[PDB]
UniProtKB/Swiss-Prot annotation, chain A:
The keyword Transferase applies. E3 ubiquitin-protein ligase which accepts ubiquitin from an E2 ubiquitin-conjugating enzyme in the form of a thioester and then directly transfers the ubiquitin to targeted substrates. A cysteine residue is required for ubiquitin-thioester formation. Keywords: Isopeptide bond, Phosphoprotein, Transferase, Ubl conjugation, Ubl conjugation pathway. Residues 228-302 are annotated as: K-box. This is Ubiquitin fusion degradation protein 4. GO terms for molecular function: proteasome regulatory particle binding; ubiquitin protein ligase activity. Residues 576-677 form the HECT domain. GO terms for cellular component: cytoplasm; mitochondrion; nuclear speck; nucleus. The gene is UFD4. The active site is at residue 650. One of its GO terms (biological process) is ubiquitin-dependent protein catabolic process. The keyword Ubl conjugation applies. Belongs to the UPL family. K-HECT subfamily. The chain holds residues 710 to 1477 of 1483 of the full protein.
Curated annotation (Swiss-Prot), chain B:
It comes from Saccharomyces cerevisiae (strain ATCC 204508 / S288c). Gene3D superfamilies: Ubiquitin Conjugating Enzyme. Residues 1-22 are annotated as: Disordered. PANTHER family: UBIQUITIN-CONJUGATING ENZYME E2 (PTHR24068). This is Ubiquitin-conjugating enzyme E2 4. Belongs to the ubiquitin-conjugating enzyme family. E2 ubiquitin-conjugating enzyme that catalyzes the covalent attachment of ubiquitin to other proteins. Mediates the selective degradation of short-lived and abnormal proteins. Mediates ubiquitination of PEX5. The gene is UBC4. Interacts with TUL1. The N-terminus is blocked.
Length: 677, 146
């Protein structure tokens, strides 16, 4: 075992020794390769506890945190070697963190656990005016406003008025490492001398940082691995995720805003360690809190008198007219954007009209008459992925910005009130929204390559042309042939730098041109819109809480609508020619096969057909090339049954062979779509 | 030297160096919409035909490819009735270094050697894959291209 123990000390020295080259991508690839050679033996992997006892975790953490190379370079260098062993290297880190985990479930002192009975567990509180005394069995959720109508001090510590009874006493007892069972035992005595929202249960603890002990190196390695862009195969820590689920399972501590700092810091800083539903529940518990959290736990319990007396959420009627639906909804959304109450929309009952409203306005925000999002630039609604367009520094951009703020407030009000939207936001929109609201990170990534791949998810043609420019930034004659000026592509009315409308583009100032274009598409060009969106969103609850999600995962929570795949709509939006007829038997069979599919089948087939995970807003009818089935003729002297359908989609074409039977055709389709993954 | 000046420079290139057979130009005072008059090769089955194309440049003319549409109806496996052309250049091989004087030449070569492997109208590809030449070109060329 000496060869598997002492050599790790030498590797640690190599990582710590600055004599090792760590500047270029090749050197980092080399050190990643030697690390993989050391960590993975010919018999079995390095066990979790062995990894941190030799300091290897810190040895590589310092080199990945104290090197002066771009994050893109490091991510590429790592994934060039570890792409085939992501879980083989994730198991080691997860085991090490499991061993070194020491975070504590800050519970209310057991008392049957966080079960059904843990709801109305009351506590004894003896108020004494220190400047007069009453003893009242006080509910653990009542705040110093909802109970004590005069500042408060417990253990000679100032107490915020908006906090609850528990929120101060519990923290007082925890911070001095007092017993976790005396809380129900001690009669804690306090010394003292528009619908408001009790969402202040994290606003004062946003920077509640707590050290992770020896696990800091492991956490840093996990964060870097996740930021390398690999899948979510094994980033979930079963021990930590279960502990967090247990902590959220206790309702009394959460309803008082007394969450442990480790939970908040880990969720905000490392969101890849927990399952999606756990993080969504954490957001539900921390964001809107008391009024909705009482009913959220009541719903779980029903599958009580105190909850039903202290968690009644009233509803406010919203009546709008179908003619001015968009504008009236937007103005009412501004007026009651952050009102804690539940808002139902009525057309001039129940979930029907309000769902219709949340759907139609989500459709409207996607049109071209508002000049909000970038368009195809060649049917008011936009089809492709929806993303903001650069503003005009001179033109009156007041209405665009106001509408963007309305969009932010609308999205937040929808997400809080568990509604379903229809947007098709680009994930890059939310990626930049995150990088903007995250401290000490530039909204535009410093590295160029990341920006190019970030616009490649927005306008693929724009990105490929810009990459052509970049790859040909050292052939001046090519730039002269391009013959373009320092103005944003797609709108000549805006220049990159002032006075550049006549500025030729050549090898001398190519980099300035690229930086200007990038800042005009992703950064300064859309900075006002993004900031207005964040302000509107945070008018209800802070956008910081949404950092626990991921860019790719909160696109879906907004793009959640039950699409229509009925037979009638499919028939009215299907084309069959060049061999097929509309009332053909095989066409009817194909429609019957398609329209009975499940959830994942639809998405897989749509990705196979068009390349998008789901069809644009409005159903199949919005597919402008008007999806068409063409009879794939049988040639080459062999039967059509063995032939596998080929896409060859120019616009919306699907080469469907004239199969001798329906079930063979379905088998071929199910075969082809899976290899279309 | 902007996108509008990119179109202007293309126009100057066409003016000072006219193509041998496949002439083209803008339409009216507007710079975006154009007109192209390409002629099928004499040795080609489409010989002796004048064809009109409606060219519509995008907003970012040098970056995204232009829209080329046939107005003179022709019979070809790779050309549809609305004038849409399925060619690699206009979709994926597109570079801002590709001038219109190159895309029209690409169409000129396409009208000689078709693209049966990637057809737009399948039955003509089925026919192509000797009297197919005549029954594909000659009558349409005589009644439309002349």
């Amino acid at each position: 075992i000496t060869e598997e123990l002492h050599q790790i000390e030498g590797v640690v020295s190599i990582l710590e020794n600055p004599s090792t080259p760590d500047k270029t991508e090749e050197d980092w690839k080399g050190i990643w390769s030697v690390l993989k050679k050391c960590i993975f033996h010919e018999d079995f992997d390095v066990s979790g506890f062995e990894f941190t006892s030799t300091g290897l975790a810190s040895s590589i953490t310092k080199r990945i945190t104290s090197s002066t190379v771009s994050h893109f370079i490091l991510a590429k260098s790592f994934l060039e070697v570890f792409e085939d062993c992501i879980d083989r290297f994730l198991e080691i880190l997860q085991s090490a963190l499991t061993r070194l985990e020491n975070f504590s479930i800050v519970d209310c002192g057991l008392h049957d656990g966080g079960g059904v009975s843990s709801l109305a567990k009351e506590i004894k509180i003896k108020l004494v005016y220190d400047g007069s005394s009453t003893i009242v069995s006080v509910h653990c959720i009542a705040s110093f406003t909802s109970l004590n109508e005069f500042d408060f001090f417990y253990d000679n510590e100032k107490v915020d008025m908006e906090s609850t009874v528990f929120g101060v006493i519990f923290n007082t007892f925890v911070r001095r490492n007092r017993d976790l069972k005396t809380l129900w035992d001690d009669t804690h005595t306090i010394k003292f001398c528009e619908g408001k929202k009790l969402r202040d249960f994290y606003k004062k603890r946003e920077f509640a940082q707590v050290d992770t002990g020896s696990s800091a190196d492991i956490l840093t390695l996990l964060d870097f691995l996740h930021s390398c862009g690999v899948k979510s195969d094994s980033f979930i820590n079963s021990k930590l995720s279960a502990k967090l689920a247990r902590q959220l399972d206790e309702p009394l501590v959460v309803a008082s805003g007394a969450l442990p700092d480790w939970s908040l810091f880990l969720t905000r800083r490392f969101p890849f360690l927990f399952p999606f539903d756990t993080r969504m529940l954490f957001l539900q518990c921390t964001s809107f809190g008391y009024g909705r959290l009482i009913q959220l736990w009541k719903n779980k319990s029903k599958g009580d008198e105190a909850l039903q007396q202290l968690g009644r959420i009233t509803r406010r009627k919203l009546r709008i007219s179908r003619k001015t639906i968009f504008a009236t909804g937007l103005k009412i959304l501004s007026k009651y954007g952050s009102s804690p109450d539940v808002l139902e929309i009525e057309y001039q009952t129940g979930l029907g009209p309000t769902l219709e409203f949340y759907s139609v306005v989500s459709k409207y925000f996607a049109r071209k008459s508002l000049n909000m999002w970038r368009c195809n630039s060649y049917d008011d609604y936009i089809t492709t992925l929806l993303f903001p367009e650069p503003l005009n520094p001179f033109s009156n951009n007041e209405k665009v910005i106001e509408l963007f703020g309305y969009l932010g407030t609308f999205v937040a009000r929808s997400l809080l009130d568990n509604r379903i939207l229809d947007f098709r936001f680009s994930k890059v929109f939310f990626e930049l929204l995150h990088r903007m609201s995250t401290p000490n990170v530039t909204t535009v990534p410093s590295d160029v390559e990341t920006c190019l791949l970030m616009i490649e998810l927005v306008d693929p043609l724009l990105a490929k042309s810009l990459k052509y420019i970049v790859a040909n930034k050292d052939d001046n004659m090519t730039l002269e042939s391009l013959s373009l000026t320092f103005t944003v592509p797609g709108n000549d009315d805006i220049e990159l730098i002032p006075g550049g409308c006549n500025k030729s583009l050549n090898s001398s100032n190519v980099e300035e041109y690229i930086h200007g274009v990038i800042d005009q598409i992703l950064g300064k060009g859309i900075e006002k819109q993004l900031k207005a969106f964040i302000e509107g969103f945070s008018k209800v609850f802070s956008y910081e809480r949404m950092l626990i999600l991921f860019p790719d995962e909160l696109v879906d929570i907004f793009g959640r609508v039950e699409e229509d795949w009925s037979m009638a709509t499919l028939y009215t939006n299907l084309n069959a020619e060049h061999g097929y007829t509309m009332d053909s038997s095989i066409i009817h069979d194909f429609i019957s096969i398609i329209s009975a599919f499940g959830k994942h089948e639809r998405r897989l087939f749509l990705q196979f057909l068009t390349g998008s995970p789901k069809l644009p807003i409005g159903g199949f009818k919005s597919l402008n090339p008007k999806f068409t089935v063409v009879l794939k003729h049988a040639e080459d002297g062999l039967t059509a049954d063995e032939y596998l359908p080929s896409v060859m989609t120019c616009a919306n074409y699907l080469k469907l062979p004239k199969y001798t039977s329906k079930d063979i055709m379905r088998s071929r389709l199910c075969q082809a779509i899976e290899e279309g993954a | 030297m902007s996108s509008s000046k990119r179109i202007a420079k293309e126009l100057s290139d066409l003016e000072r160096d006219p193509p041998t057979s496949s002439s083209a130009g803008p339409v009216g005072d507007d710079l975006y919409h154009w007109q192209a008059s390409i002629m099928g090769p004499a040795d080609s089955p489409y010989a002796g035909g004048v064809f009109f194309l409606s060219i519509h440049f995008p907003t970012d003319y040098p970056f995204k490819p232009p829209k080329i549409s046939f107005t003179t109806k022709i019979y070809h496996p790779n050309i549809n009735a609305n004038g849409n052309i399925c060619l690699d250049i206009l979709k994926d091989q597109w570079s801002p270094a590709l001038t219109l004087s190159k895309v029209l030449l690409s169409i000129s070569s396409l009208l000689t050697d078709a693209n049966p492997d990637d057809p737009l109208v399948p039955e003509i590809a089925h026919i192509y894959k000797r009297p197919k030449y005549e029954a594909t070109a000659r009558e349409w060329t005589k009644k439309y291209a002349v």
